[PDB]
Design a protein around this ligand. Sequence first.
Ligand SMILES: CC(=O)N[C@H]1[C@@H](OP(=O)(O)OP(=O)(O)OC[C@H]2O[C@@H](n3ccc(=O)[nH]c3=O)[C@H](O)[C@@H]2O)O[C@H](CO)[C@@H](O)[C@@H]1O
Ligand SMILES: CC(=O)N[C@H]1[C@@H](OP(=O)(O)OP(=O)(O)OC[C@H]2O[C@@H](n3ccc(=O)[nH]c3=O)[C@H](O)[C@@H]2O)O[C@H](CO)[C@@H](O)[C@@H]1O
Ligand SMILES: CC(=O)N[C@H]1[C@@H](OP(=O)(O)OP(=O)(O)OC[C@H]2O[C@@H](n3ccc(=O)[nH]c3=O)[C@H](O)[C@@H]2O)O[C@H](CO)[C@@H](O)[C@@H]1O
Ligand SMILES: [Co+2]
Ligand SMILES: [Co+2]
Ligand SMILES: [Co+2]
Ligand SMILES: [Co+2]
Ligand SMILES: [Mg+2]
Ligand SMILES: [Mg+2]
Ligand SMILES: [Mg+2]
Ligand SMILES: [Mg+2]
Lengths: 462, 462, 462
Amino acid sequence: DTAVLVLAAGPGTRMRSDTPKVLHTLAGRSMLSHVLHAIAKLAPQRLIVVLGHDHQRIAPLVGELADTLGRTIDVALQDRPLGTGHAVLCGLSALPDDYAGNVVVTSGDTPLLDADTLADLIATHRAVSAAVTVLTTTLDDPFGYGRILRTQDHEVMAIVEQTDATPSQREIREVNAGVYAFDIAALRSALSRLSSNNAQQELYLTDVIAILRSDGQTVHASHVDDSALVAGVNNRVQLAELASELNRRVVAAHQLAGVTVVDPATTWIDVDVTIGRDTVIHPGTQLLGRTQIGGRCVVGPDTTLTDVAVGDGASVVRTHGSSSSIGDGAAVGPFTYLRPGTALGADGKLGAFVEVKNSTIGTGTKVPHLTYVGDADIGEYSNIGASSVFVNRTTVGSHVRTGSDTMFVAPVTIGDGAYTGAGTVVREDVPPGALAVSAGPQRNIENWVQRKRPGSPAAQAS
Amino acid sequence: DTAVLVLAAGPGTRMRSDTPKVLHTLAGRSMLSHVLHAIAKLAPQRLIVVLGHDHQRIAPLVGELADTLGRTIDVALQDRPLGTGHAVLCGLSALPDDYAGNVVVTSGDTPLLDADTLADLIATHRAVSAAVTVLTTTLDDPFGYGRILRTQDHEVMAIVEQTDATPSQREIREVNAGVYAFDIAALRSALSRLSSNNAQQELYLTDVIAILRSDGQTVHASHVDDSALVAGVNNRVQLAELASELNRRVVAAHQLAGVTVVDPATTWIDVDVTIGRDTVIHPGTQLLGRTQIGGRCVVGPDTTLTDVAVGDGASVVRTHGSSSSIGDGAAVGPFTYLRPGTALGADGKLGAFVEVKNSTIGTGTKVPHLTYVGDADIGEYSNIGASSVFVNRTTVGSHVRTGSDTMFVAPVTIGDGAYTGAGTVVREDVPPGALAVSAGPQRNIENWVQRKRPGSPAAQAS
Amino acid sequence: DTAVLVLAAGPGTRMRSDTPKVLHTLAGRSMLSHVLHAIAKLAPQRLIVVLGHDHQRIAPLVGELADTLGRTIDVALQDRPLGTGHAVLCGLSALPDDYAGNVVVTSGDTPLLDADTLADLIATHRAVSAAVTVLTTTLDDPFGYGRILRTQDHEVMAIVEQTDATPSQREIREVNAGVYAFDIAALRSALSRLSSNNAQQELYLTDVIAILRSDGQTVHASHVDDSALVAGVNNRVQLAELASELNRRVVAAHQLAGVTVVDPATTWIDVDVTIGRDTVIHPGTQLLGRTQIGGRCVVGPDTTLTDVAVGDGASVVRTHGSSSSIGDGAAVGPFTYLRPGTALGADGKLGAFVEVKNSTIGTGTKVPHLTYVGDADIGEYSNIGASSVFVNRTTVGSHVRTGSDTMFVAPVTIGDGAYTGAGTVVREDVPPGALAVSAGPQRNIENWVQRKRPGSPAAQAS
Ligand SMILES: CC(=O)N[C@H]1[C@@H](OP(=O)(O)OP(=O)(O)OC[C@H]2O[C@@H](n3ccc(=O)[nH]c3=O)[C@H](O)[C@@H]2O)O[C@H](CO)[C@@H](O)[C@@H]1O
Ligand SMILES: CC(=O)N[C@H]1[C@@H](OP(=O)(O)OP(=O)(O)OC[C@H]2O[C@@H](n3ccc(=O)[nH]c3=O)[C@H](O)[C@@H]2O)O[C@H](CO)[C@@H](O)[C@@H]1O
Ligand SMILES: CC(=O)N[C@H]1[C@@H](OP(=O)(O)OP(=O)(O)OC[C@H]2O[C@@H](n3ccc(=O)[nH]c3=O)[C@H](O)[C@@H]2O)O[C@H](CO)[C@@H](O)[C@@H]1O
Ligand SMILES: [Co+2]
Ligand SMILES: [Co+2]
Ligand SMILES: [Co+2]
Ligand SMILES: [Co+2]
Ligand SMILES: [Mg+2]
Ligand SMILES: [Mg+2]
Ligand SMILES: [Mg+2]
Ligand SMILES: [Mg+2]
């Protein structure tokens, strides 16, 4: 029986943001959402998020997150940010007075923490019969962390905050993860003895460690060797670094599973993205939101895809796209823009300097050059000539061949197997197998250049 | 006198690929091709590649590689992957029974190994009169490697595989390179004593070390300080990391030789690419295949070039191109697509949102905006107006000026110094110095907007 | 009272460049300009730059740099590169014979050196009453540096150059920064005792250390813990690495100040660039020259901006731009090219495959597709249809709607609230609220396809 508290009621002033700290994203989820996803998988009996000033904005998200995860998450309010010890007290209030289970506390800014590390904590806690067990780690750069103070016999004495530490303390590299397990009575008891006479004038949760030692209670430090699993984010430097570490882990799982990633340093893949066996990812690529790539694809350099479904054997090169689907063996790019609701059939082609929006394009149909396709539906095995525009609903059939420089003025229907000559403004329906035209005939004006640009380099008409 | 065996008969199941392990690429060559290029430069008397299941696909490449290198490379078959000891035995069979030379063995997955490290091996082997000499190195992360076991007096006792190692072994950081020299008789003798009673039930080549020690033969470990020269690739994580290390070495040689590379981390250069003095490479660039860049070029950000010749003093910015040539002082980009067979003359310009395919464009001719050029030949000092299309063979002469929105309907010839008015569909030949037109005249319809869009913001025609 | 010498008279042959070493750039300034900016902020009484062969090119820049900084910088000439000791002697000559102040010497190739490190030097020098104080640091890779030789009692004895060092020396990791403070008389005295009998046959400034020790003068080494502040650049490998370190520091200051940078490794920001609170920078971005971004912007992936002003709340995605301004809440990109003199009003849009040059575009006006805008002025709340061209001065008013495929043949004026039909060549002025047209009417040719492409897939007109 376990209750988990997530402290998320801090101001987050070190982020320098009008967006609440806990809502800043990495790999496609807010920090808060990474933290709640980890804990949901542990399924504690109770789950409590402490909110503060920003509560009106954060509480709804947490609401949505609880439906997604199919459990109840309670919200407890901390009206002023009096410190992490004060934040725990606020959390406990949403538990019954007689609650007997263990209490786990973690922060809203520790976004790589995972169900495993959580479960190892709880087991260690029950195993050693600890009143408090605290996760620790060691780091080349311990700045801004609580430091772990041990006695001569390796006993944990206390945790000392960065602001409160001696210059000699501070050199300590074993750090506080800010993830704890407590016996609830021991914990209620220690919180009442907290005073705020320290460098920041706050009620520090970390002071509970020395307080329980006073009472001769058992204090256990549980070292986590993978430091990143418990790294915190307090500013945008630490956010980006953890984003970068998380992204390497995600790239690696995909490589181990059969994806070639030429350049992981410049390949960003969100947490929910799937990729098929033997696809190749070239440098400078972001695969974002719920993007899915099938097998044996080529995802070319300099491509950004957000919520795009790409089938097997497709090629997607220097393309910027969202909410769109691209079929098996289709060719997209280079220099192509897909806007939401684009659906490209299997073996379709969207080519260089082509933009598509809210349009359906059938099997094997090609839109290869310099064209805009908006609010249109196109059949199968059709060819849309270069430098054309769908001027926004237009229906084009199958096996159609439209000529370069055609403007399709919505709404207009072009029948199966119809043609359009180069330079046509289509304003009326075109029967199947008709040719539609509008351009006047060529006239050559002889010796225009001698007459109207005399002495120019072009009077090499001589 | 030396025979070199390359073991390439493993399944490669850890790559998770339907492409044979040894064919996966880095910097423009398969691993197998990196390995054979290194060994060819050593010119041993005999060179033997052990192939397995995938033999029908690999043997032809090796054939092609032997012509390229002007030597014979034999292929020996290993029908089932019984282990690296079994693979050696298969290799030896393609040598005569009386062969007396030393035998060098290396893997198909050690792609940075070089002629030097090979030659230092052979010399050390002859110098210490060793029955076996094995290349070793030491690593922060030794996972998946054979570990070197030494006696109290620093003597090599044995090599222990990752799967077979004690937890205490495993902490060993001195690792087996899998590159060996052997006395042939000692080697034939040890292979016959191999048994497969180990964690993977395989005949391990590494067991030969302990076996020859048994017989009181001389065993020598030769430490290679540059770990990368002997790193192996077993999965796509290790492939990409070695690709990244190789690419730094290649970038550096070019910098030492007079190329500015603003951002080596995001500059990928293949092994055969050449670059001239004082050229500048901006971030996000791939230079691929047999690409050659002259001196004082600017190769702009976000450019990918595969088999492109670029002369001196040219500028190539945000361009995606292959099998094309670009002359001295030409300007290409940003946002330009070159398809195969594009040849741009000196001082030519291909501009933003321009695509060129199988076309020749003469000295100083400019195609600067929004245009498609396919299957055409263009003379010198010509100007192709914006938003034009070569609708696919068309010949345009020199000092020509074509107007915006011209469609050139192949096949058509435009004489020297000719002009085209804006909006012309060219279907017939244009004499030198003629002006060709087709567009009807402008008509203004007065107060159309009051009439046909009443109350719209545009009835600020008032 | 202090005189600062910057030695910049070396050939720089290791750069392999026809551009003088000291002019090579990082983050938007030459090395020489980084060095003089640091020293100006210290405001010594005298500031002397030693120039050599390349003097005619470098002296003017230094001239310009002295006006920018509002002080006088003298130039002293060193006619042949006899060594760094000889270079100091040349510098001293531009000081009066009776000069009594301390002399600071630093190199032209130490581009991260800062006013602070300089000031700590001078204070340490005055504090210990040193005849010479030398800045040192320690490094994993000391190659190519002078090594610091200390006695048994930790006393600095001498500095030994890379070329002159024993193999055992060379293993020394404490290195010479090449930044010194001297007592002037001690310094004049030591320089006269220098001889050039060493591996490079040069008069080495570093030899002054052992020489003053001989005379029992006080020699002090002042260790700089941040190694980068005193790293030198001798080749393009060392240039790019220091560029990369400098760029991380600059990215970090912006993150600490409230800018999200998703991927610092691939975000290049010049030293003078400013960025507002809560803007987001996506990967593959260069912000260059005097670029200014306001708050809450999105600066999308794959964007390069040089001297561009972007207001608050704007979006600038896959855009290549220079000398242009983009207003509050405007949308630019993806795949957009801004050329100099582009001014986009607030809430304006420039879209995919759009190029703009020397044009003014008013509040809320949209140019969203496939268009070229050159030498034109456009009013407010106007819409420029797709695939259009401004054929170069043209004036378009406000609330105008122009149709797809319109060519505007300069010079032409389009009145407020006017329209253009699809496919119009505008050669004459269009009154306010008129509709201008030129395209002929659509003709359908029935069963053209049966007749003129019999048996083709398009005769699915059946
Ligand atoms: C005193 C304390 O706890 N310090 C720990 C805290 O430092 P740190 O300085 O990181 O403390 P923070 O201010 O980030 O707060 C921790 C978490 O508690 C929340 N919060 C904070 C104050 C408050 O009044 N209410 C509230 O709900 C914050 O939103 C944050 O999610 O985390 C570090 C590791 O990540 C530890 O090494 C420190 O020992
Ligand atoms: C037992 C053995 O040799 N292990 C070595 C092997 O481990 P590793 O586990 O890398 O062994 P691999 O399976 O990669 O095989 C080595 C090479 O031999 C080939 N092959 C393998 C099995 C087979 O039946 N036939 C065959 O031809 C493979 O294609 C590969 O090219 O390389 C490592 C370094 O890179 C060493 O540290 C290990 O000590
Ligand atoms: C003998 C000497 O000084 N060596 C130092 C120099 O090595 P390093 O080998 O870097 O010496 P460089 O050749 O770069 O010269 C140093 C500076 O002095 C200038 N210059 C050089 C020669 C000359 O005749 N005239 C002249 O003006 C160069 O332009 C350069 O700006 O800098 C290193 C750190 O960066 C130090 O660790 C070395 O101890
Ligand atoms: Co924190
Ligand atoms: Co291997
Ligand atoms: Co037209
Ligand atoms: Co130097
Ligand atoms: Mg705080
Ligand atoms: Mg295996
Ligand atoms: Mg057109
Ligand atoms: Mg030199």
